[PDB]
Symmetry: C2
Subunit: 283 residues, 2 copies
Amino acid sequence: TNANDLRNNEVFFISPSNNTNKVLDKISQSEVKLWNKLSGANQKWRLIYDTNKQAYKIKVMDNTSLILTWNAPLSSVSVKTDTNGDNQYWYLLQNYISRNVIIRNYMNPNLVLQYNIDDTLMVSTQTSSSNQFFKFSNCIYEALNNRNCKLQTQLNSDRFLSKNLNSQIIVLWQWFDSSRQKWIIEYNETKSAYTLKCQENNRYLTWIQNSNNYVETYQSTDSLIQYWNINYLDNDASKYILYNLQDTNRVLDVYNSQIANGTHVIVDSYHGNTNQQWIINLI
Amino acid sequence: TNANDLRNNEVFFISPSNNTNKVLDKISQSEVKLWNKLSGANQKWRLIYDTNKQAYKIKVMDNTSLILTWNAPLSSVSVKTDTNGDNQYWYLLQNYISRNVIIRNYMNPNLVLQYNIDDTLMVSTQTSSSNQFFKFSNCIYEALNNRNCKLQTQLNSDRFLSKNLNSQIIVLWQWFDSSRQKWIIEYNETKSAYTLKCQENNRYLTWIQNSNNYVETYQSTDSLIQYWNINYLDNDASKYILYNLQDTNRVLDVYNSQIANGTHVIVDSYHGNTNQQWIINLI
């Protein structure tokens, strides 16, 4: 799968190549360490690419916004406030076949991240040891792919993405355990994005382009209007934003932030307010 | 596109990240320098991956079989006989976004390939400069994708891959500029392989599995029998072998090396002889 590719703005679990059950973990306001995987927000990291430097910042997703930092001139690493230091940027170069990634510091490319037997981390000169090889796993793909889910608008605890009765129009509706409110999320390798299939009619969440910009269940198509980049809110791993591939500047949105049953769900310009925030749970 | 991914056995043009028209070129029996792209075989390199070392050998495809070698302890590089030396292996790690690759030597990972102002290459300590960033361009994808082509057997001049008249069966036939002999070669991102579409009926070259093992033009399908790994011969970039994805151990083959018009083209076990060698040209 290409779901784990090192794309900008994606969130990952970073694990030692020798143990897929351990992950990079922010244990305190300054310390990082390899720890048993728990899928907690402090074990999730968003990549923010800097094109000018051709390097990335690695930001923890527990709401603190701290980023992986090399404590130059020491050999230790930590999570620290973002001050745009060269020591806070990292080259992420991957072996296409092994999928292993070397996390090389920007300030001093002779140093790479290394994990030790005692689960501690540090920077060191390169060797041929796998203790300098890491694997990246996209969090959302791991949690949501091929899962039957329900999507709740952050606007109201009991208003969910639902196909309307005797219509293809998708709207908000209170929960009543209906197949019209259950969606199978599936990653599409060709588009590198997700489709969401309504259990009631086996049709997909699709942006219908016209002045209304409503989303409706539609038959399978190769058109980008049916594909979505499901991501966590920039700094909140407990909520999601769904960007449409036809125009990634547009997202799944609740019309006029209304909560009444029947309110139209649409695709509109990203702003990030609660009417564009969704709570996704597995059925 | 994923057509340029660093897959084992694929062949590439290796160029500076900022100038794809300058490529690694074998200029003599032992020397390599950057040269303007001419698409000659001495400018094509096959990647040969070693799973234990998690590194690659880089072999020139002009039929000399020499591989890119670091002349340790000197900083120069050359092409030499493959003696499996550590200095002949290279870590190829890539930046997913920029697509740039750092060519790091296996014998001493502190050293990376670098091109100089005079087009010469050398191995030296890592910087943040683009003179150490390279791009890998899959030769075949560059030359054939979305191109209307004709394919002929190496067995005899003027014997082309041709859909039969009023039949779906594909055979050999003298050239008569027929739509039954023209094939649009298109890379399929989903399968990471090629399909070949006959101009006469818009149907694709497909392996029909039965005792005859004939290839026929068939309707579009997601079945692997319709996809092909088009690659150069093991040590010659002037002709090709077409491996079928349903069983990559089998290839497009001319029945018992017969050459008369009407000879059946089939899919059979790879041996690499002339009846499995194809010459592909643009229409």
